[PDB]
């Protein structure tokens, strides 16, 4: 009641502990106001204007409510006041590392710009979180409220990215193992992160959200399973869960995998690439970095947001003329044309993403072709497709898609790109159809 | 353009919105797509995290609602002579009404420009007229208008009049279809599709409920003769719906638009724009260079003027921008101007746009009752100016008619000493410029 | 988690303590399934089919959530596990005493049938609650879970009806005074009872419900005010409260005061009256009671529900022919015709309700009348119209309508009833208009 | 009946519903108003307290949706020759489709009547036809039909066919408007306004969300030629909406309609009706006396047969009703039949309506592997029978076509000894009548 309250459209009023407020009001956190949640989705769904910032607030809030709910119903667990804060901090900072247009950056751009590099936004989040506390002297404030930084910061990072190095976690002992299933749950993909963006994306997409997370948390319990401590749902809650997965399927099919949405995101990527050489971002020690290299220094990365889209678009510099023209095509709605899609029966690896258009253009279609295509005329889009145990009332504590687009939009040539593609699919024997 | 073959855009408020190809042609332009880059509530976003929405989706909504209103009237009252041409012209009017808005919306024409160019009289509504002209000229929309049966010389004027008013005063349409001018912007009773959309839209993002059901209201809407003039009438039963709209508007103004911290942030951003104006160049027509404040004079530069300017100052390295850049960071670090108080000129004269620049000086020159260990210059004061009839029909007689200013003060110095000093400069200034004694 | 869960459309899942379940599964509680919430409103609003039963569950649930929320945030209050149950029981049973078509019964019918009698449904609730525990042996079960019946039952009754006899309450001491503001709050009309039926009636009427009760309870605090302990709202919650009152105004104006709705309810009352003599309900000791007398014996009253409407309607008995014809008029939608409405500047007392039609018909309108009316041709409907202190963040713990309808529906005579009415209003100088 | 002068009824699902005077005349009858007194989900109410809604409001909804569908088609596809007369006939069909339902809805025709009169083949759909005939005859609706341009002999048949099917098989309308028969009741693909309404309605009261947007689906609905037959087609883009409807139906069947306790209660009430049938008299035509089970033979008695019969047994003093009355109290006291188990005849033959009476006897006659200290008669067993293609069009080619049984067992004796005894009678009976081994 001495805390901060932020009014939220999804969760209503979210009360924020002073320590969380201190972290949020920094350049490194406020940065997330400037990155669209659904990336290019906005250019298909006008309601999807929401950014990573409000999402981060949501996951942190939900993070806090889960730990708190469990601890009261099971004092056995030895959940400390310190633990609750640490889970909340993990929730708030889990997406700190996302780049321009979110999943476009680490999912396509960086692979294309630096196939060499193994990079995900989660490690960005770890790196950016470390940068945040040092730049703003959060560690004293952490100590002030009863947290021990050496132990807890490790815990915080582990909740986001997983084990940093029989029991892999250095930040917390096995007896509070259930904490690591809260913010990021790899072991079935059930956690508060996704609960939030479901409700959140649905709200902004005008899609009904099916899963009642308030209820699920209320009935949530910690049970022993295979002599490991983990979070378990009431038997009656299965219907709720059937339903969460159905909301998920709807979001992935209608929104995240949208044909035009993904095209636009690849156009933006193509634009970033022809601008990469000429754009300068100032990092630590006044050093100069490019878009693709900005991930190497967290000072520079902080200033890398959706802003780069407009900065390229508004630029007069003729070095950027090539990049600028693509973005202008988006405005005029002259977009890459959709050729087709296929799935492999093994999956394409991201270090292979760069190599793919050459392969597509270099195939030899059986049928004679009226016009021939270079590799520069193809865009190939790699779209990656993504148990639970229960407890009973009467007895508690017992249990890839690949698209190809063509840059040329005349009818005759569009039919050329067609045949290169059908051949390419067949000859790396990915599936043969469709019509 | 045969029905059912249109483009459909899915919207969280209105559901699926159908777009005539001509509307689509206007939408798919740099001048239109620009609104994707301007936040609806401006600095409001920094208080309400759900209020991330931009002018773009709002404008689409008003265009859609515009269409639903005239179409509904035309179908149930054929005497009115509502043409498909009229329908399109009303939709285009709805769609482009906010084209002229600048960075952070109302912050721009409502505060910045008055502060930057006090002699100039400028509103975003006339911006919208200018930008619409630039849009149709740059992209050759006029042939397409003719293509679908519109007469550009006559209709473009109609479109502009529906937005900003008369340039019988209206040249764009005859008096016999006068009721059309009550759809997009209704000056008399303030009930129109513009208000309807942003009421519902802002509510959605603010997590505020909307009690006005516009779908219903349009269904029962009628045009009747009033004082020998044609006007839009609501069924008597719809009064309850109207009670709800005004309560929604009252809540939004009091809870959201007049929010203290929201407005503080809006003034800080304005303060930042001012000390940056000299050093920032935007390229206009003929390659000419303009500044933020002069960009409204040339639509070519203005097209490239959006919320982007906030981040540009922010990300800037130039030490000329050191004064501005540091202020924006205070926003990031959440070290903001502190709220001293509020007062109203009740029964008195209202501050004029030509006097905004002059206001902080007057405040700083006051004579505080007890003298303070701290004395404050004019540069440390901020003064914020916040600015605050239906005819019916009954069923049995379907065509017969029936029937503030706030000023706040913030201080740039929030050290304990200056703050209570800042208190009495304000209280004294209020006493001596005839405002209510603050509380 | 060993409790019962009932799924509710307004509140979601409501968990019920075993003791509450024991009380609910009795003829005396289950009775409320058979009484419509809005009475004659259903015949205007097809969505308002809901009954007192589900409403009672709601108020009990909300009752429990308020006490529980306060006790955790202020352990100072000395709220016992026993107290929480007692507030919940009060919530669940507060409407036990309502009769057929709810407010029609005690608000019009009983006054007309027995003007002599001073009767409200709240005392019914007290009487019916007492009858419930004795008939079903609840007192042992009460003792079983740690309740002391002599002390607590008094507390329970006091929360519903007020003081039974400086400090008026015998059931609880002044230091837990705040408990009496939860289920029924006379001292500003702010309590959980109304919170529920707002949300509930709104849901079924298709009216938006403005008040967020979940939030209000979350921020609710107990403060000292005028050296009496009472419940206080956060300063920020004023906007929420402005809003509760606006929802209230909407419900009263659009629904509860509906012109046709009230007419129908008076028609039903008129029907009950001409049936009252001939209908037999079996009470204690096999004794026979009538509709108006059924309130005297709780055994008989238990079997008095909306059922009486259909029993009259379906009857063959010619003694009931007079009553039956009125009900049949409702089906054919031949209803009392609306003459007009007025308010007094002093209010009509319910012991005077019976006397009113005689007065209306006996006036002498200045203008000459073409047809004259008996008292039997008039229906006069009496519709009764219905501070808060706060606390701050930084410093906790510091602060009648009267309608006249006419039974005859020809144009000439309808205009007669008109003039009797205008005269009657003027000559007991209630307001003169309207047009 | 000029538009905008109709009667409007406010509905929680559809908002305001407009009613043509002819529809109103039908609605304001004892035969129609009767549905106010029959619970939609029957015994479901005793598990879901929010499910208090009755057949009345549901029927109004289907009538409204019926109107929205044909009207939408008629406006966007004038070739189809949809008349205002057709519109009314479809609305009346929608409105009266559930007239024939009895006490607790599906409990009556789905369980009771099979148990009470096993030789008789009866569904509420044919009830609806009978009751509609009784309605129009008793209240002289036929002149009013003629009054608004309807031809009673031709149209009343059409109305009946839209409900129960053929009495080209349809005499009520020619093959050229065949698509009309897919609106109220669609037998082939089960997508119609009936399902749409009660999906949305039940969801509202159960606190279950509805993912099918019917407002949208109707907007984009089209009639196309399919196999040289006229049928209703959805736009290809609407597939996602359809994914949502079926998931809603799947949830409702699994979560609500097939609820264990709900169904148990439905069988107890049925059990109560049976032992009361002999002693209860309902007055039919010519003053003749009928019982509950025979009331379906005469519409005069049936009009007075509603959920009221539940309370009548309950409130009854007659000791003849002692057997029934005590059962209902077990419901009040919540002492219910206990659930033994469930099994399915997967890949096997389905229980026939003529065999329901015979089923408990077969169960009781089984030979349990170990003999029990408790032995059970047939009167102590209850067996419950629970019973569980779209063409599209694409925008660029607007008129070209594209493309279980459960049986449960409950026991009336729930003493610990009888219950585990009851267990193996069931498991053995299942083994020896070829059902799945229970789990
Ligand atoms: N044209 C256009 N569509 C938008 C916009 N915002 C959202 N959308 C939605 C509407 C349709 C969807 C895809 O439209 P596109 O023009 O990109 O692609 P398309 O609809 O397949 O093109 P086409 O109609 O020629 O087949 O995106 C916008 O600003 N302009
Ligand atoms: N268009 C596009 N969408 C992607 C890509 N990769 C993932 N997505 C979408 C699909 C579902 C969604 C998954 O979101 P997450 O569960 O990872 O949650 P998040 O908030 O977005 O990120 P995080 O995991 O760090 O919390 O992201 C991509 O490469 N391109
Ligand atoms: N501090 C902070 N507040 C935010 C943020 N986003 C939205 N808000 C809303 C929630 C509360 C509201 C308070 O604004 P302030 O930070 O200026 O706090 P304050 O008004 O000066 O003081 P107080 O602590 O009493 O609220 O702003 C954010 O990122 N940081
Ligand atoms: N705090 C604050 N609120 C403002 C200011 N100017 C306007 N508002 C409020 C009043 C109504 C609300 C929305 O403005 P409008 O009603 O004019 O609607 P609009 O769509 O935003 O602009 P337009 O009139 O051009 O259509 O914003 C301002 O300067 N400060
Ligand atoms: N006629 C009728 N109206 C209903 C029914 N259910 C709800 N309503 C609503 C619709 C209108 C409202 C009042 O209708 P009434 O016929 O009782 O009174 P009225 O509408 O003022 O009559 P009138 O139209 O002649 O002025 O009640 C119903 O079953 N029949
Ligand atoms: N038609 C009609 N409505 C009435 C009458 N008296 C009261 N009402 C309505 C107006 C508002 C509503 C008030 O409900 P309450 O606050 O009393 O709550 P309740 O659940 O209905 O009863 P209780 O007070 O016992 O809890 O009842 C009446 O005499 N006639
Ligand atoms: N006991 C009871 N349950 C109700 C009532 N109203 C709705 N329900 C729902 C909520 C839970 C569900 C359980 O029904 P039962 O009472 O038969 O309980 P049960 O299924 O036999 O056993 P269990 O305690 O495990 O749920 O019924 C009610 O008034 N009393
Ligand atoms: N548990 C249970 N559910 C049933 C039974 N019969 C039907 N149901 C379910 C299946 C669908 C659901 C609603 O029935 P319908 O789809 O037939 O729609 P309706 O409006 O109720 O009746 P109608 O077909 O006459 O329009 O009720 C039954 O006997 N037992
Ligand atoms: Fe996330
Ligand atoms: Fe606007
Ligand atoms: Fe109540
Ligand atoms: Fe139906
Ligand atoms: Mg504050
Ligand atoms: Mg498309
Ligand atoms: Mg159960
Ligand atoms: Mg009316």
Author numbering:
A (entry chain B), C (entry chain B): 113 to 277, 284 to 463, 466 to 506, 517 to 529, 548 to 583
B (entry chain A), D (entry chain A): 110 to 276, 285 to 505, 517 to 531, 547 to 582
Question: Could you give the paper's own sentences about this structure?
Answer:
SAMHD1 is a restriction factor that blocks infection of certain immune cells by HIV-1. SAMHD1 is a GTP/dGTP-activated deoxynucleotide triphosphohydrolase. Human SAMHD1 is a 626 amino acid protein comprising an N-terminal nuclear localisation signal, two major structural domains; a sterile alpha motif (SAM) and an HD domain, together with CtD, a C-terminal region required for interaction with Vpx isolated from SIV that infects sooty mangabey (SIVsmm). The HD domain contains the active site of the protein and in combination with N- and C-terminal sequences also incorporates the two allosteric nucleotide-binding sites, AL1 and AL2, that regulate the enzyme through combined binding of G-based (AL1) and deoxynucleoside (AL2) triphosphates.
To identify residues important for substrate binding, catalysis and tetramerisation we determined the co-crystal structures of SAMHD1(41–583) and SAMHD1(115–583) with the poorly hydrolysable G-based nucleotide analogue, dideoxyguanosine triphosphate (ddGTP). The CtD is absent in SAMHD1(41–583) and SAMHD1(115–583), and only the AL1 activator ddGTP is present, nevertheless, although not stable under the conditions of our MALLS experiments, both structures are tetrameric, made up from a dimer of dimers. SAMHD1(41–583) contains the SAM domain however no electron density for the domain was observed, suggesting a degree of flexibly in the linkage between the SAM and HD domain. The primary dimer interface is the same as that observed in other ligand-bound SAMHD1 tetramers and in the apo-stucture. However, the conformation of the tetramer differs, largely due to how the α13 helices at the dimer-dimer interfaces pack against each other. The SAMHD1(41–583) tetramer is symmetrical containing two equivalent dimer-dimer interfaces. In each interface, interactions between R372, D361 and H364 form a hydrogen-bonding network along the whole length of α13 (left, and S4A). In the tetramer structures, as well as occupying the active site, ddGTP was also present at the four allosteric AL1 sites, located at the conserved dimer interfaces.
